[PDB]
Design a protein around this ligand. Structure first.
Ligand code: JII
Length: 164
């Protein structure tokens, strides 16, 4: 069903994450972690303290798709188990470094063709696929976008609800 998913998304905040490569999204799916640039790290930390759920919606550049979505379970933390991100040209490991723990809600893909009817008020009402890494998605658009994804029957939202 979709009832527990709707409960997790209630009064949530949503952020578009743009990854330059599939390898980083795969590593985030396997390890339950994400790292971003300091400007976005600051926005996510503020959002985490502000809302019952902060949802990251992932898209790999040039893929034409979203690759799933996850809920922050922590603020960013440094030190600890390092992460072998694939870094773009211009990208050093120091610029990442802050690591958020995340709980996946859906690891399934959604093609942009299916979200063409959803516009983001916080990005000039452009289609929600359009946006820089870290762009916030308004509540109603973000909720409807997450509800478009195919159900991921491998995930049990009971433990996610308990984190709240
Ligand atoms: C593990 N985290 C990430 N991995 C990857 Cl491959 N791309 C990311 C990540 N976070 C944000 N982006 C987008 C990006 C890429 C290169 C230069 C940027 O300067 C604005 C922005």
């Amino acid at each position: 069903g979709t009832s527990k998913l709707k409960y997790v998304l209630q009064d949530a905040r949503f952020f578009l994450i743009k990854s330059n490569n599939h390898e980083n999204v795969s590593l985030a799916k396997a390890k339950g972690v994400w790292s971003t640039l300091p400007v976005n790290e600051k926005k996510l930390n503020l959002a985490f303290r502000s809302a019952r759920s902060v949802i990251l919606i992932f898209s790999v550049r040039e893929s034409g798709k979203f690759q799933g979505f996850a809920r922050l379970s922590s603020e960013s933390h440094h030190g600890g188990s390092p992460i072998h991100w694939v870094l773009p040209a211009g990208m050093s490991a120091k610029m990442l470094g802050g690591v958020f723990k995340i709980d996946w809600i859906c690891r399934r893909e959604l093609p942009f063709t299916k979200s063409a009817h959803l516009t983001n008020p916080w990005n000039e009402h452009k289609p929600v696929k359009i946006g820089r890494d870290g762009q916030e998605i308004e509540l109603e658009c973000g909720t409807q976008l997450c509800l478009l994804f195919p159900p991921d029957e491998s995930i049990d939202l009971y433990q996610v609800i308990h984190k709240m």
